[PDB]
Structure formats: C-alpha cells, structure tokens
Amino acid sequence: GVIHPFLHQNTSDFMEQRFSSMFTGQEFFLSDHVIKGQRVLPSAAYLEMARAAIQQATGGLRFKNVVWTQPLAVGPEPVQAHIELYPEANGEIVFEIYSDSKQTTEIVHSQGSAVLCSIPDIPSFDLSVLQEQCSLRTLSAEQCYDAFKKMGVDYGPAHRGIEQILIGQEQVLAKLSLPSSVVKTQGQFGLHPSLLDAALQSSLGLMMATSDFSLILPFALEEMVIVGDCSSSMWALIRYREGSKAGDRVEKFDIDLCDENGNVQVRMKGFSTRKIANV
Amino acid sequence: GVIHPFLHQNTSDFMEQRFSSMFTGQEFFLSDHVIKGQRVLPSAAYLEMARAAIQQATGGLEGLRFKNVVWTQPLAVGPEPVQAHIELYPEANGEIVFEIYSDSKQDRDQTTEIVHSQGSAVLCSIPDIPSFDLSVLQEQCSLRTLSAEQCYDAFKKMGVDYGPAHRGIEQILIGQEQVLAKLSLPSSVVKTQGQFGLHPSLLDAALQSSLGLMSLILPFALEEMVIVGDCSSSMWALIRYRVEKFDIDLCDENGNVQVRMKGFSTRKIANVS
Numbered sequence A: 001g002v003i004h005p006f007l008h009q010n011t012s013d014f015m016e017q018r019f020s021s022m023f024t025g026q027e028f029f030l031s032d033h034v035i036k037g038q039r040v041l042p043s044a045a046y047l048e049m050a051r052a053a054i055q056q057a058t059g060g061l062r063f064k065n066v067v068w069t070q071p072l073a074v075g076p077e078p079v080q081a082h083i084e085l086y087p088e089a090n091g092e093i094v095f096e097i098y099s100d101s102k103q104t105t106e107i108v109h110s111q112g113s114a115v116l117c118s119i120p121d122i123p124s125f126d127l128s129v130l131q132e133q134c135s136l137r138t139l140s141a142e143q144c145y146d147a148f149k150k151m152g153v154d155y156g157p158a159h160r161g162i163e164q165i166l167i168g169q170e171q172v173l174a175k176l177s178l179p180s181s182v183v184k185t186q187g188q189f190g191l192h193p194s195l196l197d198a199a200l201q202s203s204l205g206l207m208m209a210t211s212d213f214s215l216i217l218p219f220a221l222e223e224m225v226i227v228g229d230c231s232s233s234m235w236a237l238i239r240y241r242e243g244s245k246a247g248d249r250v251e252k253f254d255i256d257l258c259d260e261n262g263n264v265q266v267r268m269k270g271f272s273t274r275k276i277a278n279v
Numbered sequence B: 001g002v003i004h005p006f007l008h009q010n011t012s013d014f015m016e017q018r019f020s021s022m023f024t025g026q027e028f029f030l031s032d033h034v035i036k037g038q039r040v041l042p043s044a045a046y047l048e049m050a051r052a053a054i055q056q057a058t059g060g061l062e063g064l065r066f067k068n069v070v071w072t073q074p075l076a077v078g079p080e081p082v083q084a085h086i087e088l089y090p091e092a093n094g095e096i097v098f099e100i101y102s103d104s105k106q107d108r109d110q111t112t113e114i115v116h117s118q119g120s121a122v123l124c125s126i127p128d129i130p131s132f133d134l135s136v137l138q139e140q141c142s143l144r145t146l147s148a149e150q151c152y153d154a155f156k157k158m159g160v161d162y163g164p165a166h167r168g169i170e171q172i173l174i175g176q177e178q179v180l181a182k183l184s185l186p187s188s189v190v191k192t193q194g195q196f197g198l199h200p201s202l203l204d205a206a207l208q209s210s211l212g213l214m215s216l217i218l219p220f221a222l223e224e225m226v227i228v229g230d231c232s233s234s235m236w237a238l239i240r241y242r243v244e245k246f247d248i249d250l251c252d253e254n255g256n257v258q259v260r261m262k263g264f265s266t267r268k269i270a271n272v273s
C-alpha cells in the first residue's frame, strides 16, 4: 500500500533520500482543486508532503523560505512526482519537490528548508475579541466560492472548507471545517490539504475588502511553525504584515490556524503573493 | 508491487539504506526448500538479496564482488510470516557493508533483530577468466556418476527436502578433490529466470553439489565471490576441494565462468551413522 497519500513509495538511494508518487487526478485534492480548467496540486499539499517525508526519514517542525515555482497540473496523463530531502550538518533539511516531464527533465514545483526546533509557547487567542474586531462584513461560503468561480477557480466538495469569513480592517477571521466528503481521511494527514488550503483560500477576504476582483496566489512563505495537531473545525486569522496593503505588487500576510478555543496549532508568517488575473 | 522477490519495499531513512520483505513461506524458495521439517531461506538467497539491494541503492552492474560473507542463523518461516530487512552501509573506500536480519516475535519480550547474513561488497572490474573445456573436466571427473534421483534421495535421508523448484541438479560427475555438476533451472521456475541475477534455484543447486565431495552446518562463510555474467537455464558447477574450504565456478554451457566463488567454509559436525 501507500505510505501516505502524498508519499506513495520510498525510492531513496545512496545519494539522496527520496519519495515518489504517481498522481492520476482522481484523488480528492486534485479532482476537487481545479484552477483555470486544469487539476492542480494545492499549494498546501507541498507542505504536508514535506512534513510527512521528513517524519518518515527521521524514523516541533519549522519550515522556512518556502517557494512555489510551478503548478503541478495533472491532465490525461498521470504525473510522476518526487520529493528529495537533503540533511545538513546544522540540523537543517532542504527539500525539493519536482515531477518528471516527458520529452529527460525534472520540473521543479516547490523548494524549502525545515528544522526540528522546540515548540514556542504562543498564548491562546480570545476568539470572541477577534470576532468583534472582524465585524465590517460577513461572507458566506456561497459568496466565497461564487467569487472563486468567477476568478476561474473551481473548488469541489473536498476543497470547500470555508464556512464563513468575518472581515475586519487589514485582517479577516475565517471559520473552517473539514468537508464531510473527506472526513474519512482526517487521520491520514497531519496538515490536512482541505483545512490548510481553506486557510489559504480565506485570504480572499483581504481582497474582498477591496471588492475589485483579482486572483492573488502565493509564491513564497517565510516561516511555518507546527505547534500542535489540527482539528476538524478550526479558525484562520489572516493579517497583513505591517507595511503591506491590498493592491501591492507583492502582498504579504500571516495566517494563524487556531482550534475552537483559540489555541494556535499552526503559525504561518510571511506569505508573499502576486496578482495573476484581474476580474 | 515488490521491487524484487527478496526486496519487497524500500524503507531507507536518514540513518541507513534499508529494504524490507515479509516472507510468508508460500514462495518457491521457501516451500520447496525444507531442512529438518522447516521452510528455510536458502543461503544462496542472501547473496541475491544483497546484489539486488545494491543495484537499487546505486540507481540501477557486472563485476560486483562479495568478500568475507558469513551465514550465522537460518531464517525459518513457520505459520507466521517473518519480517526480514537488509541494511546497506557505504564506506569511503567504495566498499558496501550489508547486514540481513529479521525481527523476532519473542512473546513476553520486546522484538529483537536476528542476524542471518553479513558481508561486504565492492564494485570492481570484470576479470578475464579463461573458459573451461567441459570435455576435459568431464574426463577428469570420471570416477563415478550420481543421478538426480540419487542426490535428492540422499538429501531426503539427511532430512533435507528439496521441492521441485530446488532440484536443479541433473547429475554430478565425481573426480578426485573435485566434482562437476550439471545444473538446470527446473521448468517450474523458468518463467522467473528474469526476476533474479543470482537465481536461487541454480546457485542453491551449486551449493547442493558440494555433497558430491563425500556434515556441513552453520555458520557458513565465503572469502570471495565475483559476478562475471548472467546465469543461464543450463549451467555447470565446478567444485574443487582446496582448511575446510572449497571453490565453486558456475559456468554456462560453453564453460565460461559466470560466477566465481572462492573459499566456502562451513562448520564440521560429526556425521551420525
């Protein structure tokens, strides 16, 4: 069987630690994640792939300086994907996720580094205070995914984890829930692609503040800290990094994934995003 | 699926290169290789496991050499499947140390690793070994001829029950301090010829043929082995008695040496009756 939905088989050799996966397009994280008519691997999937791969290769994880370079599109031909892990003497693990292109060449999709550090003691959020601060407008799930549909982003049942987005000033607070379609798979992932992708989806609220429609995908992430486990229902607090405003050539924001009580389970700092489509 | 009949899956981690295999006992190299009532992995299998493992770990050829191999413990597969592993440790001088072990299910205790085989490997060039004149060797080994029925009848009497897949001996020609054994892949397993480099049926048949030189028990050891070429459907095993060491040349129909083994040693036990 498979080691992990993103790690089908270990293919390590004397030179490199490596895992390999054949994505067909029938997996929920591809068939229900269609951007501009083509099934594309969610940005969140790469982080979970690197996390699981590191967990296997080692027998308090922090990612740093992650980049998303090229989308992994799965058309009529299955795609052979790989992740290689390079350990360094200082405890740092460099990962690279690529796929095999047919003419031999490797297509690079994501790079980054990881370190196993101690877990920081982040104080829990008062969700009541945040909800009041984000009372300018409330966006329903229908409103969010209607906007996405207009931008050419077709999210299937497994990737409609947004229940609603509470909009504030330079921040939004999004309520997330694992879709009932994929609850069976909750235990197969640490960072579930449905929840984590929904957290990144919720950055739409920052754009909806501007109202004027535009598609703004992330290309980089400065830091990610896994503090604890994810639950089926969570919250995403998204804030513009000081000095960053909506409409910038490169929009920078942070995302905190919190449990029902306001505990920070995953802290993401320094998303960088570029506008790729208007209206 | 499985990478190789002896390498089911790669399980390497940052610490070690590793492959793992769960043997059920239904495989031909276990059900047809019964010693003293137990299905046991043939000694020949360990070399093929190490060879296949090295081929995967290096990204795959010929010219491989094993040196200072030991066989310490038999891998018996009873009613419960057995979990086997091979770990490969590369060294700076180009040498690869391998260890083949299995997880023991000692109830009331915590699982422990049982070592079955150890050795080293090096990727070296192919030696230009002169072909043997099989006609001359057949003449030198004219003292006596043992048929297949005679050999495996003797084995059965000794408590060694070889099934169809491990009856590769067609006959043994007896000489002085040497024998020449005619080997053939049993038709039961000819389909699998391409799945192995060192096919366990042929290589085990070569080691079986050491019976011709007039009991041998574990631990075993091998000073050197050189893989020169591929194994064929029909082959010859030239066994020469060199302390308690003998050499085996696995040859094709024309006398070309495809596998050269030097310095097999096995513990000597008194023979009962």
Ligand SMILES: [Mg+2]
Residues within 6 Å of the ligand: A016, A084
């Ligand atoms: Mg590489």
Ligand SMILES: [Mg+2]
Residues within 6 Å of the ligand: B016, B087
């Ligand atoms: Mg080990």
